[PDB]
Design a protein around this ligand. Structure first.
Ligand code: HEM
Ligand code: DVE
Length: 448
């Protein structure tokens, strides 16, 4: 019932083309097969891709039992470790998930904007020192966000310890971790992974060491001199539902994950956004962005970013729309499911691509055009943050981070993209972002 693309090489499959260009390969699969839904073989494994925006509801709705993400996202354990992310089943993953959620509440967001905005201005005075100057944005942002993410989630104690090493190293230690065309084949990363074997463990060291000093540093007990409800402190104090406590190797793995989600996708998104806004073709938009923020005070607050920054969010979302950081959302088909006229059978890897769907013509016309005031012409087409049972729970914070950054930066600077056109998407990484070497930019301080 479901279609399949022709397989020239049986064992390798289409992983050759998909790697060279996944956007044009998938669009070519969809176009030639003459169907939104289709199947491809990656390493003797049927991968059914949903390219029809109207059928998104089929993909994202079903429960974990019908479509499981665990056994497809096993490739991620080398990055966090054991007992983190999709290593545990529902209960323990839900347990850690709600530890994160506990730190991401409507109440705790009151600190975030002041905390973020301070950290930005700090980094800005630290790295962008002269009135003018040249610096590549992707790496400078990667640092920016590592502070703002850490400051909000883990608090003031860590942002301090990590410093110049995490400012650039944890950034790099994470930038390093990325690996392409291995997810579909989890067998490859097992024996010979390129660096994540050393980098994740080397990364694991630096924070295991500062995880051991933290007991000797603060009083933080019965003096009530600081009401610390941060993530880490509570994360190593925490006990699971089954009685067992967090391991030192585990809490380390969590701190890594929280920072990954808080930084990697957000920094990509922060960059794309700025790149688009500083282009000359989008001056009409940049002008509009200033009309929005120019009446704010120096000290922004929660209400300013949430309630009073509509267009900035539009720019951020459309940037995530055009070049979605996560290409392929995937599930293990542990039970049959109807998807339009076809059926997808048990045992398959069913997947849905934000990249593909965001470039569907009906939903998004002239999809390569960054138009922040556009809207999804098909409902539920945009899946940048996913949807359904596994919808991103960090969407608020991500948008808060980015919008705040944009507000703080563009208020006190002007940027000149040292290129004719905007950077290409570097699809070498599965976690996609603008091409590193194309991101060189002249900053220019603003003065009244
Ligand atoms: C631009 C920023 C971000 C993007 C593009 C993004 C993207 C995504 C996507 C596509 C998914 C769904 C994957 C799927 O359906 O299988 C998702 C889920 C999730 N994201 Fe994000 N995310 C972002 C920021 C964040 C942040 C800041 C956090 C935490 C601070 C976070 C934590 C999560 C969690 C916990 C899930 C749950 C998925 C599950 O239940 O299996 N994300 N994210
Ligand atoms: C840090 C969290 C969990 C956050 C986890 C679930 C997030 C962070 C990175 C995310 C978004 C990633 C996910 C989905 C969920 C992850 C693992 C995936 C696996 C989505 C599928 C993509 O193909 C792949 C590139 C990304 C990798 C990053 C708690 C353990 C505290």
């Amino acid at each position: 019932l479901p279609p399949v693309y022709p397989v020239t090489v049986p064992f390798l499959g289409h992983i050759v083309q998909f790697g060279k260009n996944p956007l044009e390969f998938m669009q070519r699969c969809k176009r030639d097969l003459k169907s939104g839904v289709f199947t491809i073989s990656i390493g003797g494994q049927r991968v059914t891709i949903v390219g029809d925006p109207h059928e998104h509801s089929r993909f994202f709705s079903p429960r974990n039992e019908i479509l499981s993400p665990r056994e497809v996202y096993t490739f991620m354990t080398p990055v966090f470790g054991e007992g983190v992310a999709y290593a545990a089943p529902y209960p323990r993953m839900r347990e850690q998930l709600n530890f994160l959620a506990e730190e991401l509440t409507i109440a705790k967001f009151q600190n975030f904007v002041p905390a973020i905005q301070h950290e930005v201005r700090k980094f800005m005075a630290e790295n962008w020192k002269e009135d003018e100057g040249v610096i590549n944005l992707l790496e400078d942002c990667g640092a920016m966000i590592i502070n703002t993410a850490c400051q909000c989630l883990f608090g003031e104690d860590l942002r301090k310890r990590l410093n110049a090493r995490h400012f650039a190293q944890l950034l790099s230690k994470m930038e390093s971790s990325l690996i392409p065309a291995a997810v579909f084949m989890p067998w490859l990363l097992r024996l010979p992974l390129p660096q994540s074997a050393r980098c994740r463990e080397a990364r694991a060291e630096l924070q295991k060491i500062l995880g051991e000093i933290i007991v000797a540093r603060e009083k933080e007990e019965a003096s009530k001199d600081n009401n610390t409800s941060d993530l880490l402190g509570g994360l190593l104090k925490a006990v699971y539902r089954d009685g067992t406590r967090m391991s030192l190797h585990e809490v380390c793995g969590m701190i890594v994950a929280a920072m990954f989600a808080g930084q990697h996708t957000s920094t990509i998104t922060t960059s794309w956004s700025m790149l688009h806004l500083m282009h000359p073709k989008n001056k009409k938009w940049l002008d509009k962005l200033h009309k929005e923020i120019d009446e704010f005070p120096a000290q922004l607050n929660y209400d300013n970013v949430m309630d009073e920054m509509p267009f900035a969010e539009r720019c951020v979302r459309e940037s995530i729309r055009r070049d979605p950081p996560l290409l392929m959302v995937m599930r293990m088909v542990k039970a049959e499911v109807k998807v339009g006229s076809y059926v997808v059978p048990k045992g398959d890897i069913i997947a849905c691509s934000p990249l593909l769907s965001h470039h569907d013509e009906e939903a998004f016309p002239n999809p390569r055009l960054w138009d922040p005031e556009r809207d999804e012409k098909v409902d539920g087409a945009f899946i940048g943050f996913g949807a359904g049972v596994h919808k991103c729970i960090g969407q608020k914070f991500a948008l808060l981070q980015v919008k705040t950054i944009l507000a703080t930066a563009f208020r006190e600077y002007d940027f000149q993209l040292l290129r004719d056109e905007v950077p290409d998407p570097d699809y070498h990484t599965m976690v996609v972002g603008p091409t590193l070497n194309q991101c060189l930019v002249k900053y220019t301080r603003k003065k009244k």
